[PDB]
Amino acid sequence: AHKETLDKLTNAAINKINLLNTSKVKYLVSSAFAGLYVGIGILLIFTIGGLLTDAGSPMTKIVMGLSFAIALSLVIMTGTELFTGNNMVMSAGMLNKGVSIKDTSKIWAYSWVGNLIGALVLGIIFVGTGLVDKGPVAEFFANTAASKASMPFTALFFRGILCNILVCVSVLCSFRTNSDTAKIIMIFLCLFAFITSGFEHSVANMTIYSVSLFSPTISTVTIGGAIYNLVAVTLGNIVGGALFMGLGTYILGKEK
Amino acid sequence: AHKETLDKLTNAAINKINLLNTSKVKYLVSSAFAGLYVGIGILLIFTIGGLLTDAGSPMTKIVMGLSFAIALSLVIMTGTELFTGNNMVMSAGMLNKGVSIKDTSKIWAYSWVGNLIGALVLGIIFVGTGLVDKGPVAEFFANTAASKASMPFTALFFRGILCNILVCVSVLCSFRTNSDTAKIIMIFLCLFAFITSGFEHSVANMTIYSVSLFSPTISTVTIGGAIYNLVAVTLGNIVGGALFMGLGTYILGKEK
Amino acid sequence: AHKETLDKLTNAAINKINLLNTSKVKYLVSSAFAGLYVGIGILLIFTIGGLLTDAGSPMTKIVMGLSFAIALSLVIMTGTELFTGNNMVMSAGMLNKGVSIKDTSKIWAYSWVGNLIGALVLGIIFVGTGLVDKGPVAEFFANTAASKASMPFTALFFRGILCNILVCVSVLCSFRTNSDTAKIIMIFLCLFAFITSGFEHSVANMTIYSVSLFSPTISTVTIGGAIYNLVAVTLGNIVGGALFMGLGTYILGKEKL
Amino acid sequence: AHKETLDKLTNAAINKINLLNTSKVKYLVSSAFAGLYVGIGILLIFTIGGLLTDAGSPMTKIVMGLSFAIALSLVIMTGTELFTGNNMVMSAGMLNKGVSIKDTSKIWAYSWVGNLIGALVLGIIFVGTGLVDKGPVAEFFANTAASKASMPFTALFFRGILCNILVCVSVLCSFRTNSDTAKIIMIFLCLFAFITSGFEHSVANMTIYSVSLFSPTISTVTIGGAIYNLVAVTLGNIVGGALFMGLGTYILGKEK
Amino acid sequence: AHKETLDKLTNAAINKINLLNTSKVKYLVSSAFAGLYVGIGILLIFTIGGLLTDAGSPMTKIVMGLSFAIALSLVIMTGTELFTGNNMVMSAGMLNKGVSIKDTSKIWAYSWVGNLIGALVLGIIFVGTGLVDKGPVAEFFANTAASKASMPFTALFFRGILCNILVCVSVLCSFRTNSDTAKIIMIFLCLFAFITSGFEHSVANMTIYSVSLFSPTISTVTIGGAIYNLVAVTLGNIVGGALFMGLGTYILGKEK
DSSP states (O other): OHHHHHHHHHHHHHHHHHHHTTOHHHHHHHHHHHHHHHHHHHHHHHHHHHHHHHTOOTTHHHHHHHTTTHHHHHHHHHTOOOHHHHHHHHHHHHHTTSSOHHHHHHHHHHHHHHHHHHHHHHHHHHHTTSTTTSHHHHHHHHHHHHHHHSSOHHHHHHHHHHHHHHHHHHHHHHHHOOOHHHHHHHHHHHHHHHHHHTOOOHHHHHHHHHHHHHOSSOOSSTTHHHHHHHHHHHHHHHIIIIIIIIHHHHHHTOOO | OHHHHHHHHHHHHHHHHHHHHHOSHHHHHHHHHHHHHHHHHHHHHHHHHHHHHTTTOSSHHHHHHHTTHHHHHHHHHHTOOOHHHHHHHHHHHHHTTSSOHHHHHHHHHHHHHHHHHHHHHHHHHHHTTOGGGSHHHHHHHHHHHHHHHSSOHHHHHHHHHHHHHHHHHHHHHHTTOOOHHHHHHHHHHHHHHHHHTTOOOHHHHHHHHTTTTTOSSOOSSHHHHHHHHHHHHHHHHHIIIIIIIIHHHHHHTSOO | OHHHHHHHHHHHHHHHHHHHHHOHHHHHHHHHHHHHHHHHHHHHHHHHHHHHHTTTOSSHHHHHHHTTTHHHHHHHHHTOOOHHHHHHHHHHHHHTTSSOHHHHHHHHHHHHHHHHHHHHHHHHHHHTTTTTSSHHHHHHHHHHHHHTTSSOHHHHHHHHHHHHHHHHHHHHHHTTOOOHHHHHHHHHHHHHHHHHHTOOOHHHHHHHHHHHHHOSSOOSSHHHHHHHHHHHHHHHHHHHIIIIIIHHHHHHHOOOO | OHHHHHHHHHHHHHHHHHHHHHOHHHHHHHHHHHHHHHHHHHHHHHHHHHHHHHTTOTTHHHHHHHHTTHHHHHHHHTTOOOHHHHHHHHHHHHTTTSSOHHHHHHHHHHHHHHHHHHHHHHHHHHHTTSTTTSSHHHHHHHHHHHHHHSSOHHHHHHHHHHHHHHHHHHHHHHTTOOOHHHHHHHHHHHHHHHHHHTOOOHHHHHHHHHHHHHOSSOOSSHHHHHHHHHHHHHHHHHIIIIIIIIHHHHTTSOOO | OHHHHHHHHHHHHHHHHHHHTTOHHHHHHHHHHHHHHHHHHHHHHHHHHHHHHTTTOTTHHHHHHHHTTHHHHHHHHTOOOOHHHHHHHHHHHHTTTSSOHHHHHHHHHHHHHHHHHHHHHHHHHHHTTTTTSSHHHHHHHHHHHHHTTSSOHHHHHHHHHHHHHHHHHHHHHHHTOSOHHHHHHHHHHHHHHHHHHTOOOHHHHHHHHHHHHHOSSOOSSOSTTHHHHHHHHHHHHHIIIIIIIIIHHHHHHOOO
């Protein structure tokens, strides 16, 4: 069971360095589709957070957390590239040696730049809608945009650790079943979990900092506070995806 | 995986005009339906919005985007012609040289009109019920059908982009999975995102203005404003479905 | 896929009038199961409607719609004869030369009369439950039954279309997928819409003007006001079932050949 | 599709008496399993009424119906034997001569009794939990078991009919599809329907009264109403399965 | 239908011990997974209940039970080794001779401890985030670690029994169907039922007593209250799985 999976994970890992070594335009795009897809999820639950944080309701983080299913679901279904999964994958394929430590940091790089490109594009467009001009919407943006850049390191690190856990554990669950519906539910869950709980996702945080910097209605974080939050959380994501899930998957299904 | 998708996409475009070119009756009826189905979605959400606006609920815009999955789900299940969705289909199709740059417009036209024919035929029939005869139902249709015409062209554009990114990706999602349940789910999300977040949909607004103009009890906008909108937004809906969605599927899946 | 679907729609007309001929007991029964099944869901959403009207809640009309799904789902899953439905199937199956205007009108009658007999039986049985002796629910029933009589024939007619447009469209959907999960899900949305929006449904209104006439804890409507509501609604229903759904499906799927 | 369905039922019943004609120990520990599964619902949906009635939220009777779904679900997904199911099963079958009045009743009382062991077994255990010592949960048990016992036979009898119409019909639906998912979705709506509407279920009452009795903190029921209710309701559920759903399904697909 | 399921249940328990009689490092890393997953569940539903108790919303208990779905479905979807599951499985196999009384009480320990390991890990990494710095989260994590620990043995014995009754029947449901969707749905139901009703699942508490025993902000009772709770609850899970379900599932499938 775990072999057929660490098998699936290994092949897919390969099929990633192969497309990269084909066209960079291709790999670049698909990374900058996942970023934009995932970013869509921030817009929903932030248009949310405002309306419910504003009216005092205690349901905000709950309703928000639930309504972030559209994120990793657009990704997995469209078959696009997102770094947070490239972690657990590109790892066990480096452990199961389908791709090397070479090919791993080769990936995690471009996908991360790709993933950012997507956020930035959705930013421009999203900001260009006047939606984040006035109101308690860009207010929820700004504050949490600021909330997260002022947060100490080990949190953003350790919060980041638990995030890419669920994210991978879902991505894995995708590999483990053939019912797309079932994938979407497991995802729906694993994101309801991390979001409401209150964890951190780099490719996500990007769309947040993608909007709150093009903003003609505030900064409260600058670029410096963004770099920090990412590299903090990026760093966190990796231990979670690679050294827990990426590794443990490699073990559980190693033809030993 | 992306290759295959592209092919399927390409046929759908080929198989589109092909039909339009055999019959214009059969195709008009289809867009006619589609635009009405999408407008059934509007009646529902607006009968909600007035009922929740009247009671000042902090949720109203969250319950609405939840209650819109019916619109596009009815399209994809009855297998009918939706102008926005085509934007991806024909653009990726025309691109993949399966169909022409003149087969492309001849679809967009013939559907953007069909949908509206439906929007109309449905708009009339709604009025003849008279939930619009007065009260917060009739009201909501108004106060909102006004707000759209009196809005920057810079807004209606990017609003109308991000919407029809979520609309085609929902469609793209139906072109990649064989679960009719998962097809519906993703459609249910994508409209949760685009409607709750305040994006704009040409074929939907058609029913809005199909009803704020047939309703004896008042306008506040009149044709020009309705035209200033469908136009400012349909263009956006093309720029989203074509330049973003269709070009990317194309890039992500052509043999280099 | 529109041709293969008409084929199905057509093929479905055929073995229906074939069954009515085969025997009238077998057919009328099913018809009643349908009425009952649909009416069942009326008892649910009104109880909800009473529970929640009584507390002046805003989300009443909304929960009432989100809940009615069971009505048309039982129909489809049990595979049973529901008037509003045959409005689309039988028509487009005629147009597609499946059977005659004879069998069409002959089917529309029995279904409508069997749907009625389920509505009948359910009502008495339900009055027997004593769950409409007094309280906010027998109220909601009468409150609601009256409106549906005390309403202009023009709007009862029209509302009654869209409703059958939505019922039939969900039927149409039951024919274009092999996912019983998908069937129900689309029935869900379609009813959520038709109900919460404000549309009217002969077979389900059949179950409303059955409770409030059989309950001795009030007529505020009596038989006439029903005859009125039914008629206006049964027409509209027909005008959406056979004329928008029936026609369209045919025009989409008839081989010009 | 009717004749297949009928036949399925008919064979289903055969297997039943055959199992009963094989092992008594095997049949009566399946029975108890159902009743126990069923009773679990009653715990949850009274734990719900508890909280919900205690804060007078109008939605008490609504959330109960939505939550009682696990009952027949656990039974139907686990091939366990539920008395109320065999009312339609045993009868549809014996009407096709797949069995005899005798098997039917043997079943009907056997199944009924194991079922009664379930509720007996649960309640005891459930009493031992602390959850009925005090708190608004127990008031809800007492007050309910009470009314359930102190209500005109006529009534209870009719509430029986309606209930088992839904119970069996849902079971009917299980026999008519293969999407195990759907079997559930329907079970869901049928129980949402039957609880929230007011109808009485026999098996499920067992647990109710069982809990109330073996609760040291006040009964208001005594075994006095127990028998009364368990009879009046059961007598209804028999006309529910047998005379409606049972004989009705036979008349629907017999080679006549 | 029950034979396939006992045969399906036995092959299982052979592998579980045949995994340990092959590798410890294999088997435990999966059990540290199961535990963590279940924990992540507790990290969510307590995150809620902290917010929802901080505003007396009567709906606290219920919402929490609906959102707990993730733990056992994660454990299921990822094949990992969960203790409570085993209870029924083993004994169902040690009763139909595929493993021994040894292989049974052998499985039950390593996993029990494997599970505990992972629960301790997430714990620190959860404080590592500092979401138990203060707020009602750590508060709720405090009252409920202690309320559970300053509770009679017998109650928690009876409580825990009922739980693993459901937890195993949902696992048993896994075995009896090829729809992951359906599997996950039954877990969602079986979990919502055990938590909102009140019952006590040991491997979860492991995370609670892990979260709190590292929460810098307080112990409220200590280690002799954590051990007692775990002992009181674990043994209750075992009668419930081993004796109720296991013995039972066995009786149902056994071949005379």
